[PDB]
């Protein structure tokens, strides 16, 4: 059916059969990895508002 959005998540992307994730069954794959410098800075700013950068 048209007008549908499907979100899929997994921890081991290597385990997904390539036919399950192709451009037309999954239109955008994004990698959510560990923290970076900017991510840690933003988390610190959000958790403790008011402190100097």
């Amino acid at each position: 059916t048209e007008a549908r959005i499907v979100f899929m998540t997994t921890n081991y992307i290597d385990r997904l059969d390539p036919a399950l994730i192709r451009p037309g069954r999954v239109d955008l794959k994004e990698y959510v990895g560990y923290c970076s410098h900017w991510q840690l800075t933003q988390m610190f700013q959000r958790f403790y508002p008011g402190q100097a950068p």
């Binding site: 390539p18 036919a19 192709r22 451009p23 037309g24």
Partner: protein
């Protein structure tokens, strides 16, 4: 077909790597010929030989 005793049946097979356009072409052909599509799943639980026939 009738004059030669050949059964009036025909079948088609489309094979290829995923994402190349099998199902889309089948839908387009069904639309072009003004036919309907009878989706049948062989690997079902209630499907038997007599029921399939």
């Amino acid at each position: 077909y009738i004059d030669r005793g050949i059964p009036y049946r025909r079948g088609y097979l489309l094979y290829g790597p995923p994402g190349c356009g099998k199902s889309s072409f089948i839908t387009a052909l069904a639309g072009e010929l003004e036919h309907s599509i009878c989706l049948l799943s062989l690997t079902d639980s209630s499907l038997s030989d007599d029921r399939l026939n």
